[PDB]
Write a protein that binds this ligand. Structure first.
Ligand SMILES: *[C@@H]1O[C@H](CO)[C@@H](O)[C@H](O)[C@H]1NC(C)=O
Ligand SMILES: *[C@@H]1O[C@H](CO)[C@@H](O)[C@H](O)[C@H]1NC(C)=O
Ligand SMILES: *[C@@H]1O[C@H](CO)[C@@H](O)[C@H](O)[C@H]1NC(C)=O
Length: 606
């Protein structure tokens, strides 16, 4: 029903191992073994993981130099999955391949390659940032790392532009300056001429680019305070309004991907406050207080929080595949979820008790709309919890901590116990309502990774671990799904909140998906909603207005005046101006008509 078709032990005793399939239409897998750096090894499969060949000896410093290569990091081009760069940890040196590591060539380079930033569309183009010097130099290559020019020195921060919003080759940069105040510049010819260069904002402290938005900071006064500046869709930057009684030291941009900005301000007692804007990103309202926040700390002069997306400091998580849905943890903790980008929040429940989600991460994808797997616990021992209702309802799927992944649009889910040795793969074809066991090897292993072969329809899983000696297995589970799904095996589904509203963000979205109990191969792409239709407005289409905050008791769902406004939340006796009741329609909400829209919307006042 399921078979292990590839199993390979690498006579290798490094303490880290990463394994990456080249991509969806590809038989190549690259594996990199590293320490915690003291040594490394590289292995490549050209047969879907049936066999791996050691190719570390191809990574050498050339004729008459025998000193061993030590790979810190490798990089895969997202524009061309045949291309890789392996960077030496110590020497100023790279190896590049254009053919899945069949041929590698070494190149000595004028900096150590701490961080390379490969362009997402132009496969020859990349940046390199020399972080070892305090001299802070940005290097650019247009031949995939063979030759490099130094395009900017004294770099405080920089970023590639983003398509489609920026012209081709766009780079944004800000330099360190003796005064501490600096200019954000944009160039389309790598800073080679005045004519292809543009001032974006001046007297800036920091800057960041995130999707359609750009953020920068200035200082105002009389204690000084940091003012946030924002651009939406590459229009000129404008000052955001953040009214508080006390100085703001920094902003954390938590998310800017759904036509609004979530921003966190303050980090007292490992808590922060979550604010949301409308589309322009300029008028923020307090959506959620006391969100868990843990950072390692920084030098003390950062005004925009730097962090990696896969390691957010705020316990706040966008659910993929769905607009509107985010999950957070607040504080004696509680997990909450929103279905309307922070307009209202609800407590998560399992069978009911309060469900607390440790964010082992939350797994969700556009290829399986409404399916979420997460790790957490109930009351007061971690288990695996599953929702197939976009987080509205949850069940406990498996007890104990596990790796989990899935294939074929969520139609087959796999799980392996973590933190103990095992030779057991759990699999479910019904969203975790039942599970079968497949013994994937005779002897137990500590498992360190569980992956799905890329491709939305894939039903091949990679397992790697050891008992130190690395083992890599490939499990083909295709036959566990049997024959192709037919019309009988699909049902219409609309995401809803916990109350049953299938009307989210002012419209009803309809997906065609495979029923929970159908055992069949789903060969269809139904990732994109079949029907969308508008609804009459409800409370759920509204959020707190500038000057207001969510009631402390979230279940009241009432917006009240924010004390930070010092009693001036409602300030303008003439004409017919529009006085807010505390609410504004959520950015991108398409609701229309009905009772609620009236007297949630502003009041006409003389
Ligand atoms: C070999 O060449 C590399 C890269 O140029 C250099 O960094 C290293 O010092 C060399 N090692 C020896 C033993 O000559
Ligand atoms: C897995 O099994 C299916 C059905 O037998 C086959 O079509 C598919 O190519 C296999 N995949 C791999 C990577 O062996
Ligand atoms: C729903 O409303 C939006 C504007 O709010 C409009 O653009 C869209 O055409 C409407 N869609 C449907 C399917 O009626």
């Amino acid at each position: 029903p399921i078979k292990v078709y590839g199993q390979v032990s690498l006579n290798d005793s490094h303490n880290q191992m990463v394994v990456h399939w080249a991509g969806e239409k590809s038989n190549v897998i690259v594996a990199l073994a590293r320490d915690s750096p003291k040594s490394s090894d590289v292995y490549v499969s050209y047969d879907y993981g049936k066999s791996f060949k050691k190719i570390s000896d191809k990574l050498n410093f050339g004729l008459g130099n025998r000193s061993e290569a030590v790979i810190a990091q490798f990089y895969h081009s997202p524009a061309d999955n045949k291309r890789y760069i392996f960077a030496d940890a110590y020497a100023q040196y790279l190896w590049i391949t254009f053919d899945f590591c069949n041929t590698l060539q070494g190149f000595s380079i004028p900096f150590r390659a701490a961080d390379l930033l490969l362009h997402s569309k132009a496969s020859n183009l990349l940046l390199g940032f020399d972080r070892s010097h305090p001299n802070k130099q940005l290097w650019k290559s247009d031949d995939f790392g063979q030759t490099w020019i130094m395009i900017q020195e004294h770099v405080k921060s920089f970023s590639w532009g983003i398509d489609p919003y920026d012209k081709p080759n766009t780079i944004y940069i800000e330099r360190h300056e003796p005064s501490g105040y600096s200019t954000v510049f944009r160039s389309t010819d790598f800073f080679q001429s005045r004519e292809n260069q543009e001032v974006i904002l001046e007297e800036v402290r920091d800057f960041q680019l995130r999707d359609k938005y750009m953020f920068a900071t200035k200082v105002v006064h009389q204690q000084s305070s940091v003012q946030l500046w924002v651009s939406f869709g590459r229009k000129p930057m404008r000052a955001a309004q953040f009214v508080t009684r006390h100085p703001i030291n920094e902003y954390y941009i938590a998310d800017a991907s759904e036509d609004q900005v979530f921003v966190c301000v303050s980090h007292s007692n490992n808590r922060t406050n979550l604010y949301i804007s409308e589309a322009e990103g300029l008028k923020f309202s307090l959506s959620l207080e006391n969100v868990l926040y843990y950072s390692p700390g920084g030098a003390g002069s950062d005004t925009l929080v730097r962090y990696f997306a896969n390691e957010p400091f705020a316990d706040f998580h966008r659910v993929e595949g769905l607009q509107g849905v985010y999950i957070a943890t607040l504080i004696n903790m509680r997990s909450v979820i929103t279905f309307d980008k922070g307009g209202t929040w609800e407590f998560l429940q399992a069978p009911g008790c309060s469900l607390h989600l440790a964010q082992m991460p939350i797994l969700s994808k556009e290829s399986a709309p409404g399916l979420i797997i997460a790790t957490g616990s109930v009351g007061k021992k971690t288990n695996v919890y599953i929702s197939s209702s976009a987080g509205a309802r949850w069940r406990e799927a498996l007890p104990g901590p596990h790796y989990y992944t899935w294939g074929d649009h969520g139609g087959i889910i796999t799980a392996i116990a973590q933190g103990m040795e095992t030779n057991e793969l759990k699999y479910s074809t019904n969203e975790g309502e039942t599970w079968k066991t497949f013994i994937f090897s005779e002897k137990p292993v500590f498992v360190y990774g569980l992956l799905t072969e890329p491709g939305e329809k894939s039903t091949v899983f990679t397992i790697f671990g050891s008992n130190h000696s690395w083992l890599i297995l490939q499990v083909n589970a295709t036959d566990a799904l049997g024959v192709p799904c037919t019309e009988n095996d699909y049902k219409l589904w609309s995401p809803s909140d916990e109350r049953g509203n299938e009307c989210l963000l002012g419209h009803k979205t309809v997906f065609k998906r495979r029923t929970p109990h159908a055992t069949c191969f789903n060969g269809e792409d139904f990732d994109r909603p079949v029907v969308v239709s508008n609804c009459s407005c409800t409370r759920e289409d509204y959020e707190c207005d500038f000057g207001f905050k969510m009631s402390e008791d979230l279940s009241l769902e009432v917006c009240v005046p924010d004390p930070e406004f010092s009693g001036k939340s409602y300030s303008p006796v003439g004409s017919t101006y529009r006085r807010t009741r505390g609410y504004r329609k959520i950015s991108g909400d398409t609701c229309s008509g009905g009772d609620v829209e009236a007297r949630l919307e502003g009041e006409l006042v003389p």
